[PDB]
Amino acid sequence: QNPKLGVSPIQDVINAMTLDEKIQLVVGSSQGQLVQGAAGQVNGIERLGIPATVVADGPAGLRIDPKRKNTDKTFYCTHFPVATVMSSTWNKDLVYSVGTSMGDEVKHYGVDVLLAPATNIMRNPLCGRNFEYYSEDPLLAGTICAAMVNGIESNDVGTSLKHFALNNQETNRTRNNVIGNPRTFREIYLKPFEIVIKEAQPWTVMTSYNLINGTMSSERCDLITEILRHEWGFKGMVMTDWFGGISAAAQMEAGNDLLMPGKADQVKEIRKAVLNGRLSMEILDRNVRHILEYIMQTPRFKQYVADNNPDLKGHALVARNAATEGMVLLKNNKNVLPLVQKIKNIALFGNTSYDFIAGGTGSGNVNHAYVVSLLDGLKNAGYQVDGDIQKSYIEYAPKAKANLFIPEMSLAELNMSAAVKNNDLAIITIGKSSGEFLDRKISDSFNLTKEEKDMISGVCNAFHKAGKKVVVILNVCGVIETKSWIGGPDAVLLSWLPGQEGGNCVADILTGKENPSGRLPMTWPVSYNDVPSKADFPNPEVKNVDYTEYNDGVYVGYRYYQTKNVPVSFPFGYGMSYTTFKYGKPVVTKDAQGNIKVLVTVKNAGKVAGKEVVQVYVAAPGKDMDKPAKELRGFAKTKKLQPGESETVTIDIPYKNLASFNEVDSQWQVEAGNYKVMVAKNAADLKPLTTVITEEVTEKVRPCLLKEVK
Secondary structure, eight states, X not given: OOOOTTTSOHHHHHHTOOHHHHHHHHBOBOOOSSSSSOXXXXXXXXXXXOOOOBEEEOSSSOBOOOOOSSOSSOOOOOOOOOHHHHHHHOOHHHHHHHHHHXXXXXXXXXXXXXXXXXXXXXXXXXXXXXXXXXXXXHHHXXXXXXXXXXXXXXXXXXXXXXXXXXXXXXXXXXXXXXXXXXXXXXXIISHHHHHHHHHTOOSEEEEOSSEETTEXXXXXXXXXXXXXXXXXXXXXXXXXXXXXOSOHHHHHHHXXXXXXXXXXXXXXXXXXXXXXXXXXXXXXXXXXXXXXXXXXXXXXXXXXXOOOOOOHHHHHHHHHHHHHHTOEEXXXXXXXXXXXXTOOEEEEESGGGTSOOOSOSTTSOOOOSOOOOHHHHHHHTTOEEOHHHHHHHHHHHHHHHHOOOOOOOOTTTSOHHHHHHHOSEEEEEEEOOOOSSSOOOIIIIISXXXXXXXXXXXXXXXXXXXXXXXXXXXXXXXXXXXTTTSSSOSEEEEOOOOOSSHHHHHHHHHHTSSOOOOOOSSOEESSGGGOGGGGGSOOOOOBTTTEXXXXXXXXXXXXXXXXXXXXXXXXXXXXXXXXXXXXXXXXXXXXXXXXXXXXXXXXXXXXXXXXXXXXXXEEOOOSSSOOOSEEEEEEEEOOOBOTTEEEEEEEEEOSXXXXXXXXXXXXXXXXXXXXXXXXXSSSSOSSOOOOOEEEOOOOBXXXXXXXXXX
């Protein structure tokens, strides 16, 4: 009898394979697939009861092919917001519930493992994939991402952080080299993955393209084997990004199991490797076994075959709440928001107010049916959109598309007098969207073009000379230049990329039914010259392309800003709500073991209801080593507190989370001396509620991630 998976001893199953069958497994494949589209697939050796599993593209939604031929019903996918909206809530329970509705699509439509979600650190705001990365803080990113995996892996469908390490730049990423000392990698760029591995236990882990100090990330042992499998306790499968990696031999020996998607040349190098006698069978057998442990739990092996009954109607409701709570109000002046009931005619400005953005382009882009543009979001909330300005913007785009991403429609064609003749208030929509492959340009992606500035001030002064107010809707995919033009507009809402349910979420924020309780996952600087990692990042308008150095140490997006008090447009975690909250006493019981457990009760006295993102920042003197000013060591988003309401919330900080890695001893450490704790609104708070503590083997590791030496 042929031994098969789930019955014969696992060891006896690998025996029955030959070198032909083994290499077929570790190198997957790709009209021609079981599910239409949806990116890669994994091979199956059928005689041993092994199916051919499927993997698709997220992370902003399951990506499958629309209806084509020989099918009865079209198949589409709910366009959820981007991973920055998820991070902008700070509500891991909320993100849990989205991965629930996200994973339901993954299972019902015939997928086994979705490529979700990348949780790399936001290092420089000029990165193309900043929308699919979560935050600049590892603790916020690593924790929110862990709950995202949980919601998708409670449906029994796999999850892969889309890029394992050091994919913070998108210039020559195929041959880019990151160079930095061990502590910079472990505390910062390895931390968000450390959390998700320990708790979420995702099935697969996708390695990145670039190198580390000289050796490829997908072909590095200490990274994939010592740090991943042996320190964090990873049990699943390690794959590569498609067509990623040089030597197929080093990938296998580094502990990288599966090669994706699969080419003819890979097999030939792996075929020659074992026959000549370089790649050992134990190495190949180790990689195959991780794939066997991987396939066992997939519903393809249990044969819950695709029924294609998603119920897309019910899942869409969840996204509207995730985007709404994930929207952050950047400035409210004279309490102009929420819009009062008197506003009924509204003038709509911005090309992207009618071609409204939902999510980033390229691989993250998903198949949606309808896009709730802003033009329609104000039509479900009852408001009347201006007939003339809607006529000017709808008809302008064809001419501009005809001749040589799109320059803003100038105010010359639009009737400036008619805007104050019928409409009560005006809205602006600044639309930016950077693709994954091409990095952000200074001219338009960060700074605003002059086609935007002359619409900002031109609309502002003309309306402010009518007593009226103007609100800017930042439909952007990341940080932009703000300080120059921010003063004019009275209200500025930051919608990020709200997915398909776009205008409805902006409508609820404007009408006042919902309360934007979103906080910033990143720090917006004044201008681009404030960024410390700017010196260590290329200019998309040879260093920082072929090789890259990390001289900023532990301090990244906001750690540098706090220790050195750099001016910034909006600090980390800054956010506003219509009601104003008040805090409870800062008293934390000191655990007998040594860890820290903080309690607090927020007090709300506001007309409308809202939610409070309690944030705990802990400081460090740094007598042993240079230390960041204040690193978040816990957070808490409360319930929907009513007028005159108050609920206690819990925030715990383990003693391990009060540790920091040391280069010399190749180990983590907690520095002794007088230490400081805080509970604040935003990261850059002058006056937070402090409770001082006296901090007295946390983790001993081998010297991984060093710098090469001849």
